[PDB]
Design a protein around this ligand. Structure first.
Ligand code: ADP
Ligand code: CA
Ligand code: CA
Ligand code: CA
Ligand code: CA
Ligand code: CA
Ligand code: CA
Ligand code: CA
Ligand code: CA
Ligand code: CA
Lengths: 720, 372
């Protein structure tokens, strides 16, 4: 709302009345009083009425009236003057648009006699231009042996010869004509001048054609006429090099001496580009064909520029130049390439020196070698958890198992009893009031083959699409389940059997002696997997279940939580057996002959300890395969596939940090992982013992202290 | 009771077999060889054209033509010869009682799709057929349903993001740079050591050299400095005429056209920028698992060190909070066929088959409506 201080606005809206203005060439003139109420049909008008009220304030009303023959500038100026007159006021006025013949009835109400229209009006202030128009018809002769120059010649076939080169300029088309007896340098100069006329005078809105004798296009024959016999050409001597040397006079205009000064810089071309000083104004006089260039510096005064233009106009009548001489005004960095030809090696500022370099538009990673700090590991433990699985998982679910190439429903008495070598689909319905919703889980066993997991994915997608696309999917593998999936069975453990169906063998028979390992996390979710029944497979933290065809055994270690014992007795009621409650250190001989072994199971004093829910063991992956060394977490609990052969691994158990290396792990990975594990020990927030030992573990030679933290160890996993 | 056929017709290789099997029965290169010399000994066994491995075994006297150039099919008579050879000579089965599953690259011209129908019901007279996207079959063969597939074979290299088992059409990207272009670039840069290879048979030899003796460098400039400073990276290859050639830095310069396409003069970006911009054109919530499920397919992803280089380049481009997992199964050369073989053998699949009846009441436009 910036106000304007137009001097005719000072008499507007001061006394109650009616005021009319007319637009004449981007300005307002008030029409006289006896010309009120009538309007020209080709002009634009600004109408003001101000009305006194009873309470003392003075209201305003703007109209702007447009005829049916007014131009764009008059109507636009009327609109902008209406806006600026409202802004000169304190926004208290309402504006109206009035069209000739379609006026409002209140606009008819202002004038007593009525509206009457005359033809004509004041002319528009615009001058007509067309975007990107050139109307050019010129012809240039380029000629020389060493000092090659261009000279404008009149457009006719008689001006042509065979020993020079010619440029016919027709606006958007430029024709380069090379003589048969023309030499190398004037051909190169013809090419340079033609590309200069295209890329600088016309900004690339042209096309350059190159022609010789007998291959003239239709454009040259149309402009110039039919082709006569050419009158040969003189051999290129050294006298016309001296003639080309004497063609231009470079003059200086400067007030640096405190007075007017027009002085000769040079009369011998090729000139020096450094002679064009930036603080002065220079004149080049190639006035034989009628060209005078006025080159202005960036740091030249205005009187120097006007003096340079005046001196260039004075050069017309003194030396008797012909009456078509163009005075071309050129700033710095905007030079005509007919001006550039008189200078030795003209240098544009963004030129290429030498062969140059490509830009390539796309770059590869060049990350700097930073050392990695391990204190970011145990700090900043961000976690997303679940987004819509708020229910505790009673629900209404359907479980399918894939056999061969088809899914079948499982038995409804067996929900949480999966096979390790099979693939399952679990459809789950929300009873929860959060707009209901459905979840499809795709469970894949570790021992399951490629055909089963591929068919599970395809049937999962098909079951999603044939329910209308409303459920969302969640691929899950064995060992990496969310907390919501474990809660689907309602406090029951997840029983994982060994073996499963196949296309060629069918359902495998279960073994006579079966051994089961029970795990439970800090939350309470609990698994019970089948393991091979040897005496060395017992974990002292865990609860084990032995099913023999004579009797059953429920073996409890010192580190077993109560959830592990409840899951163990639930598995006993699943297997229909009555245990005898074996404890650690008080095993009978029948238990040991049932295993077929004596001793040497997995035992460490950390696995003896009861307190492990507060401090989980944490597994870490160390690699440098992206070039930079990175340690990452692995979510979920611990199995074989987390252990990477090509990478180094760390296990933190609060009293002994294991370092595990593969067969093909690099040694600098090992050493800088040792240093990273040490720095991870000192930087923990709860203060621990600084002499916590680092023990190096090799692949295939692992102590039972390392092995006992893993659910379902396989000795022959890596061995083919 | 009839066993369906799965025939993945790639640009460089044909992988054909029966549905339900674990491996394709016939793998043979899709070439047509024609004699170029003068036959002087009469009788014998001279044929006008040789197809497949028979053309490879006699390639010294044959000119070799690929029917498929950069994914699209140029010659259809030669492609009919390829289909006749893979039905009658390789699988040795009559195709008029077996439904045939075919595969196709996405963002293909539409005129191929009915034309592939136009042979199959008219010459071979199959009872049913189906056309499937190669990338969704590669993703199904991995056991996944959501993820991004980089499928790079002999003709094209395309990134396809798939969510809930359906490809997103607004983010599929195609790059016309694959194994034949790397073979031609290796023919170009072996002239620097003085070895000339111009013949199509010599193109096959250079393709074999590229398969045996090439790898992706983890960083390009340090590997170039290592190759300049010593000769520990040089390897020798024996040509079939007994000549022994030695290659040095050209082992790793030829895979680098995958990551820097400006070597063969292309303005377009590398495969890692293509994967990053393909991920970036998806919705904001599903970008978490697209970075974590990045499978690779095709024979051109079989170089040593391509997965580590891809994880290095994607990790530098992605935000640091994201988790990157490049997934490279060892069976990824035949993952399209495995996904097609499992998908065709299902008992729930026998209503998506485009049978003869709806084809000859609907014309060659049924493939645009039943095959999505
Ligand atoms: N071990 C390998 N290393 C590098 N490239 C390979 C290797 N094996 C095959 N290729 C390339 O893979 C291409 C064919 O891949 P594939 O996708 O299986 O066939 P198609 O492209 O015909 O579908 C061939 O051009 C070949 O050069
Ligand atoms: Ca007017
Ligand atoms: Ca107002
Ligand atoms: Ca001359
Ligand atoms: Ca000055
Ligand atoms: Ca199985
Ligand atoms: Ca869905
Ligand atoms: Ca425990
Ligand atoms: Ca490593
Ligand atoms: Ca392919």
């Amino acid at each position: 709302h910036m106000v304007v201080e137009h001097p005719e606005f000072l008499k507007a809206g001061k006394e109650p009345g009616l005021q009319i203005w007319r637009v004449e060439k981007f300005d307002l003139v008030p029409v006289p009083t006896n010309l009120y109420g009538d309007f020209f049909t080709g002009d634009a008008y600004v109408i003001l009425k101000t009305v006194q009220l009873r309470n003392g304030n003075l209201q305003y009303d703007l109209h702007y009236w447009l005829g049916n023959e007014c131009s764009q500038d008059e109507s636009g100026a009327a609109a902008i003057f209406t806006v600026q007159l409202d802004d000169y006021l304190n926004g208290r006025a309402v504006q109206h648009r009035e069209v000739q013949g379609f006026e409002s009835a209140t606009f008819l109400g202002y004038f007593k006699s009525g509206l009457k229209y005359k033809k004509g009006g004041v002319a528009s202030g615009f001058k007509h231009v067309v975007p990107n128009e050139v109307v050019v018809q010129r012809l240039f002769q380029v000629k020389g042996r060493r000092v090659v120059r261009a000279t404008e010649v009149p457009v006719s076939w008689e001006s042509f010869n065979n020993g020079d080169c010619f440029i016919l300029d027709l606006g958007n088309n430029i024709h380069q004509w090379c003589g048969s007896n023309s030499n190398r340098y004037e051909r190169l100069k013809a090419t340079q001048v033609s590309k200069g006329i295209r890329d600088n005078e016309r900004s690339g809105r042209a096309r350059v054609h190159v022609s010789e004798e007998g291959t003239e296009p239709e454009a040259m024959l149309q402009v110039l006429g039919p082709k006569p016999a050419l009158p040969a050409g003189t051999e290129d001597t050294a006298k016309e090099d001296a003639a080309n040397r004497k063609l231009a006079k470079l003059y200086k205009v400067s007030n640096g001496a405190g007075t007017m000064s027009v002085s000769l810089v040079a009369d011998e071309n090729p000139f020096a580009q450094g002679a064009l000083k930036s603080e002065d104004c220079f004149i080049l006089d190639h006035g034989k064909d009628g060209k005078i260039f006025v080159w202005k510096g960036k740091q030249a005064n205005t009187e120097e520029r006007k003096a340079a233009l005046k001196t260039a106009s004075d050069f017309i009548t003194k030396m008797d130049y012909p009456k078509q001489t163009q005075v071309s005004v050129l700033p710095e960095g905007g030079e005509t390439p007919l001006f550039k030809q008189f200078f030795k090696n003209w240098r544009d500022p963004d030129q290429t020196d030498g062969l140059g370099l490509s830009y390539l538009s796309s770059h590869i990673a060049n990350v700097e070698r930073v050392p990695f700090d391990a204190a970011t590991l145990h700090t900043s433990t961000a976690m997303a958890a679940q987004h819509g699985m708020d229910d505790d998982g009673t629900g209404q679910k359907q479980i399918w198992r894939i056999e061969g190439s088809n899914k079948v429903p499982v038995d409804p008495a067996t929900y949480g009893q999966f096979y390790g070598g099979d693939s399952y689909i679990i459809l789950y319905n929300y009873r929860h009031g959060g707009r209901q919703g459905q979840i499809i889980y795709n469970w894949q066993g570790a021992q399951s083959t490629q055909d089963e997991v591929a068919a599970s994915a395809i049937l999962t997608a098909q079951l999603d699409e044939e329910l209308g696309g409303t459920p969302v999917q969640s691929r899950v593998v064995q060992g990496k389940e969310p907390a919501h999936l474990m809660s689907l069975f309602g406090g029951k453990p997840m029983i994982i059997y060994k073996g499963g169906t196949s296309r060629e063998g069918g359902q495998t028979a279960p073994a006579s002696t079966r051994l089961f390992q029970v795990r439970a996390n800090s939350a309470g979710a609990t698994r019970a997997v089948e393991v091979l029944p040897k005496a060395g497979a017992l974990n002292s933290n865990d609860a084990f279940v032995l099913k023999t065809p004579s009797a059953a055994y429920l073996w409890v270690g010192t580190g077993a939580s109560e959830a592990e014992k409840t899951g163990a007795q639930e598995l006993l009621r699943v297997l229909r057996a009555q245990p005898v409650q074996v404890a650690e250190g008080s095993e009978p001989d029948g238990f040991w002959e049932a295993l077929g072994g004596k001793a040497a199971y997995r035992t460490s004093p950390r696995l003896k300890d009861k307190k492990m829910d507060a401090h989980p063991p944490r597994l870490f992956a160390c690699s440098n395969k992206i070039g930079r060394f990175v340690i990452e977490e692995v979510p979920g609990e611990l199995m074989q596939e987390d252990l990477a052969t090509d990478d180094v691994m760390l296990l933190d158990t609060w009293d002994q940090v294991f370092v595990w290396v593969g067969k093909d792990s690099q040694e600098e990975e090992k050493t800088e992982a040792l240093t990273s594990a040490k720095r991870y020990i000192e930087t923990d927030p709860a203060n621990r013992d600084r002499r916590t030992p680092i023990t190096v573990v090799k692949q295939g030679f692992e102590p039972p202290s390392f092995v006992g933290w893993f659910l379902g160890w396989d000795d022959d996993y890596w061995s083919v | 009771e009839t066993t369906a056929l799965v025939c993945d017709n790639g640009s460089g290789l044909v992988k054909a077999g029966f549905a339900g099997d674990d491996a394709p029965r016939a793998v043979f290169p899709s070439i047509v060889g024609r004699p170029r010399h003068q036959g002087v000994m009469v009788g014998m066994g001279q044929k006008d054209s040789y197809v497949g491995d028979e053309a490879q075994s006699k390639r010294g006297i044959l000119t070799l033509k690929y029917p498929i150039e950069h994914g699209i099919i140029t010659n259809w008579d030669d492609m009919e010869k390829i289909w006749h050879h893979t039905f009658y000579n390789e699988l040795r089965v009559a195709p008029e009682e077996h439904p045939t599953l075919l595969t196709e690259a996405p963002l293909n011209p539409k005129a191929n799709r009915e034309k592939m129908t136009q042979i199959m019901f008219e010459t071979f007279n199959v009872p049913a057929m189906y056309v499937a996207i190669q990338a969704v079959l590669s993703l199904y063969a991995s056991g996944r349903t959501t993820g991004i597939v980089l499928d790079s074979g002999d003709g094209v290299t395309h990134n396809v993001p798939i969510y809930e088992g359906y490809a997103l059409p607004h983010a599929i990207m195609r790059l016309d740079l694959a194994g034949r272009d790397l073979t031609d670039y290796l023919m170009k840069i072996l002239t620097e050591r003085g070895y000339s290879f111009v013949t199509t048979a010599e193109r096959e030899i250079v393709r074999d050299i590229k398969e045996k003796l090439c790898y992706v460098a983890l960083d390009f400039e340090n590997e170039m400095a290592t190759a300049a400073s010593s000769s520990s990276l040089e390897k020798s290859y024996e040509l079939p005429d007994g000549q022994v050639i030695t290659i040095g830095n050209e082992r790793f310069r030829c895979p680098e056209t995958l990551f820097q396409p400006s070597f063969i003069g292309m303005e377009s970006a590398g495969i890692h920028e293509t994967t990053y911009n393909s991920i970036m054109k998806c919705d904001i919530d599903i970008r978490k698992d697209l970075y974590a499920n990045n499978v690779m397919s095709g024979g051109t992803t079989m170089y040593p060190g391509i997965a580590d280089r891809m994880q290095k380049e994607i990790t530098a481009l992605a935000p640091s909070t994201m988790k990157i997992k490049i997934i490279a199964p060892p069976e990824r050369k035949y993952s399209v066929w495995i996904g097609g073989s499992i998908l065709a053998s299902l008992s729930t699949f026998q209503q998506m088959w485009i049978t003869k009846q709806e084809y000859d009441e609907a014309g060659p436009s049924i493939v645009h409506r039943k095959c999505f």
